[model samples]
Target: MEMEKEFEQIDKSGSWAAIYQDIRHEASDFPSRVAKLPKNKNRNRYRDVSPFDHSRIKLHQEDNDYINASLIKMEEAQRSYILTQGPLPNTVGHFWEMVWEQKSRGVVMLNRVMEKGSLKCAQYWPQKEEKEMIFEDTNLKLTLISEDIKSYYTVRQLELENLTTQETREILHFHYTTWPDFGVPESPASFLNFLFKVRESGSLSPEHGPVVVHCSAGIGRSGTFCLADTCLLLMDKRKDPSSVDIKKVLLEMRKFRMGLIQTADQLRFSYLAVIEGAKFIMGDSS
Candidate 1:
């Protein structure tokens, strides 16, 4: 079982860079036709990153049904994650529609709305003062019921109502405010703590739909989050976590969505996170 020590060995040997590059090269050619259509062009935040057509989330109400999102299912682990781009100005309604129809309990946002003086994501949800925001396209209203602020992240309890049906459901919005675009978090401790906090809320379980995970382009920080979470979960389920190859797991996830875990630095950080996360799992087991 190659664990922390082996991970360190690979790090010292300087093979992590090559591994990361190989993953990127192998996935560079996967086709995604829907996002390329002229009509759907503006729905994407980045022209290069598109969801695989077969696994992309489709909105039932829209004829186009293209919403820059992909469903990543780990069948054996009983885990599913919807990795998606940060909502574009026009697609926020579709984003909520996908969430509503997918039965997702929470949305895990890794990047902030504005980062380094540029807009990374749209302010898709309502602010505390605004209280409620309506999406005309989807006929849905999002109300901020409560907010719990932490040093690095905030948890917002939201009430989602269907304007026509008057039916409402509670949704959790887990927003990590400090992660920079194309970079890893300051530490795995904070990130894992936030992850566990989200997990404790039962948002990522099978009873719910896939947790919608996003960043700006949806492939960098978003992919890192899913990879770490999935690896930790698999480690917990299997008696021999040594058999769980992190690279192989990510390669499988990439088939469902393009450009996951973008950089070598991010890939290295995933190892650090998984190593730290496995210890937490062990402590829990004991």
Candidate 2:
């Protein structure tokens, strides 16, 4: 109740827009500690894509082979995630390489293979009939072990293997099918269900490796999901969702990954989801 009074001052004006703009204003030119890029030709298309200085993920094996991705760690929420752009044809091998090297337990894919006639993402996972598919570039093979379809999402079991080591392990793919590009999900209940589904599967837990989250740009919806999840986690712990300074949290998160919560609508939807999600977390009797 005391926390609610404190927020009344800032939130009285219905200014999520103003709040989001202010946070974006102080945004980091390079949110993560910036790094210098060395040349690499193996990248697909050599297309003009590489990690930003601050938010890039580093591979222990490859000194300078950087993919357009970043590692965002939230210790308070006991969560760590890799936010990256949708894989390009050339970067598919690099994608699997990161997943393998990181020992990621699951992938939270927010975008579809195609959206609004634009190629939002690639078909990285294998189809139902395929047993195993190999990427010559990375020399890692991805196999479709099983898949379960649902109304709002599809749960897939994939096996990623290091051909050199000949070692393989199972990975879960939590693909949200209803999310449209540049828009929010249908409702917060469904969104939270999807989130809990991933959480229940031990994907979002810190015990395992960072979960891979990607949309087209890797910043917009990806950030939204993590931001809400973290807030919900905090709220679930403290039992005060209203007291969470959403703007401040986003600012802190931006320090680790650039361009999270891309648009004002996205930010607004984030608050809506967070508010609704808080209720979902603490079941209201009414």
Candidate 3:
């Protein structure tokens, strides 16, 4: 059964609390060292990356009437793709109809592929039977592709590194050693190394079209990855550093999508991740 069906069978509030604890425990060791950095030392590493030019690229907030109309119009537009995180909301059926209205549009939806992770319990989907699952629901007029993109699901205080690099390399189109559950420690070098791993893995697939990423709320973890990828692209362009403002980029993303990175913590982490990514990519001593 899907997430909604499973939700109806449990005590949601209690289950969520338990899940939160587990996540916290998993993430606890990866403390946010960036948070403790001196303000003056907190540099924007993406300065050497790329510039943000949205002239031809349209920007729309998620709730804007234009977006709604565009979504409908998108159904007819070929070469368009839709990326969604987590479970399908009730309105999803309507969205599918609109997608079908479009000719040959591709849609990719991402959720936690692990049965015990947040996407399952928090989003309340049925247990995952495999590391990655793909389904084509012709009756619903859509196809679904889900994968456990990351091995680390929680940031616990305990420094128990469970990052499965080999498995990640095997499964993901891109590879990066993620922050330990709580957050990566304040070691700039370690964080830089993490970014280097992502670069080496070549996670950014511009040729594949825009990739969709998500955690439970389509924020936090998902946002962090998106922001990092965008920053990496900017760095590759060698544009004016000041032109690469992540907050501005995220705000622009939010304009196009309602809950781009909903939580302040997630947004902050995304910034940190980008900075570290820049340092790593540029070969700076961490």
Candidate 4:
């Protein structure tokens, strides 16, 4: 049995909305004391969205350890993800510093730099024209190694270096170009294709550090991606995929980072994508 049927029954019963509410009720209310530090105010892209202090990633190399990021771990699935907001103008350096220090092999960006004529994220990586850009604050340099373009997403090879130590490492950058802000992808199949692509890259493998997953606010779409991914992986191991509870998994995820899967539509899309993705995990031939 697959969670596909559970999703279908939920859809048929039209209780998805109630389920979302119930998830909110069960989600923890933790204080983000570090994010509230007067000095850390400008580091946050959105005023209301802040990382819970307990799960927040600390930048050990710098005097200021705060970053608008949270480490989300699903113990049963044996998966770890760092959910963060899009970097602000001044925090881009801190973003990369966190990447280098965390030893993450990949960065999964779910939103574009600009959307609806508004800047959603800072130009965090070097453009092809820029070749290589240096982050003076963190004493790091980012060089664009290669670019692979697809219809809906782009894959890039980035070399990150610590200037002080002159040490360098390569990291994968997975960007979904067509996904709109707070919106689902064109189709679950397309989204699943991209998800599997990342999975196949082994960027999310246990040997590496947690994969950095982000969006404009870093909760809505980012949460959707992680939720679908974790559920499908859990489904793969169990005798019955229906044993996976999407709502409960999300609630647990939100305990690490607040306001995951922001909208009802996003939650529904997670279910649809998970149900579709379960086919592969369940040994579907076609």
Candidate 5:
């Protein structure tokens, strides 16, 4: 049977958790050599997660070039994304600095501020009706101009201002509320719709800055999101969806960001999402 058909069956069987666990161990060769100090530990949103040394984002002017963020460049697909943990209260400044420096056009938030009785992330963006908010550490001001809400998601138009240079630009904030941390969504259709909406905004294009994607830890949920999106991009380029190697693509992505697609279930869901998304692209409404 075809790979798409195989993935459909696999999604039904739901056995990927076992094999994907092994895949996680195999990818564990990536070094976790950065910011092991106690001071830096507080900067991470999740205690157990850390950005890989090879791809970790370095903050300038700070004595330590440590931040729980990584730049993933999918050059083949002409896509670039900064995958980072949800902003910590302390690292929020570094987050904006990276955003301003990297020229990210939008922020894709996959996790909410609080989930399952713990703080998943900080409240980084300003409220809808509020004036501009400033990050004192980075000296950047953020203004929320407008917001559009859906049943499961919210899209906000934000204006980012550099207090030092007096420069400003617009940024889009896309929050996917229904997606659970470290888990898959209810369906790929809604996820694909959100993905398509982001693509349509032109922020995800190489013509602009990358779209920053994050969850609580910026690995599991974030990884699933990137994997599905990249696979779809490759499928379109190759003109054959199954021709693209999902495992190989994800392994390459993990090199840029540690521990991507955190669970076998997440891995399985990625395959299913890719298959369903490919069908959509091929005009298979059924």
Candidate 6:
């Protein structure tokens, strides 16, 4: 059944000239296609020539190098974010700076529940006495919490590090069903249930300031959470829905932070998550 559906999406026509003509008419902005070359014994020699070197003859050497370099940087940045975004800040330099600043401020750092507990602490200090500094620092508090495993623990042996000391005593973590993967359909009801449970436990309060959320790079998960929260607030106020632009909000966030849900898949998931969150909120209110 799925195979049939997939086949329906394929373009089976083998007529290149017809397709090219149609595309030329339909897409006036499209670039012209390269002419087909005759079979040549010199094809092997042409293959050895670098694309950039060939472009120099057309006076496009600088453009070629710039485009190639830009692509490589983009690829490197994407890989860097995916691996560390869930736990650390977006960039390595920024992550280290954030750590230094947080440590200097006596702020507590929390690791995602998925990381190894002992190793997490060990990364800070290897000696037993130095490790004891974590416990002794009364001001600093670090915790690891996981909903999937229902496991919660503090790394530095401290009380609960709640962020809602000012307004409402609620600290909520929002997650998208499609996150970490793009194909999964989100369950609005299930996510609402999770939020409701947290609310009942007095962990999520809207009256308080924003809650903290971090995913591999803190961009994908955190961006989606913030987007959903903003959308919900706008909807609740009965304000102009047309005024709500999620993409603009995300773009502003990206300007401030290098990589927040940087990938196309992550952006799509963020949009879906926001819609699901709005549904959850409206359904509950009724």
Please list the residue runs of candidate 5 whose C-alpha ends up more than 4 Å from where it truly belongs after superposition: 8-14, 284-286
Candidate lDDT scores, in order, read 0.87, 0.77, 0.35, 0.89, 0.82, 0.32
Question: Which ranking of candidates, highest lDDT first?
Answer: 4, 1, 5, 2, 3, 6
TM-score of 5: 0.92
Model 5 C-alpha lDDT per residue in residues 11-121, reported as the tens digit of each score:
678767766876776674567678567768888766667777887788775577788888888878878888998888888888888888888898999888888888888
Q: Model 1, 1-286: lDDT tens per residue?
A: 4778778787889998888888877763567888899999899888688887788889996477889999999997888999888998899999999999999999999988888889988899988847689999889999999998989899999999988899898999999987755457667899988889989999999999989999888888888888888898888788788888888888898889888887888888888899888877667853
The per-residue C-alpha lDDT of model 1 at residue 250 equals 86
| Model 2, residue pairs in steric clash | 32-54, 34-53
Off by over 4 Å in 2: 1-14, 31-55, 239-242, 284-286
In TM-score terms, candidate 4 sits at 0.95
Number of clashing residue pairs, candidate 5: 0
Q: Write the per-residue lDDT of candidate 2 for residues 40-156, one digit (tens) a residue.
A: 444422243335565577665545567778888777777788988888877888889889888899999988899988787678989964557799877888889888999989999
Give the per-residue lDDT digits (tens) of candidate 3, residues 54-133. Answer: 21112222331110111100111121222233333333333333333332122222233333343221222223333222
lDDT of 4 by residue, 1-286 (tens): 5466777788899888888888888899999999999998999988889999889999976488999999999999999999999998899999999999899999999888889889999999988836789999999999999999999899999999999999999899999888865457657887888888999999999989999999999999899889989998888787776789888899889999999998778888998888778766557667
RMSD of each: 1.7, 3.6, 18.9, 1.7, 2.2, 16.3
Check candidate 4 and list the clashing pairs: none
**Candidate 4 Cα outliers beyond 4 Å, as residue runs:** none
Show the lowest summed lDDT stretch of 10 residues, model 5. 1-10
lDDT of 6 at 218: 43
- Backbone clashes, candidate 3: 28
Off by over 4 Å in 6: 1-210
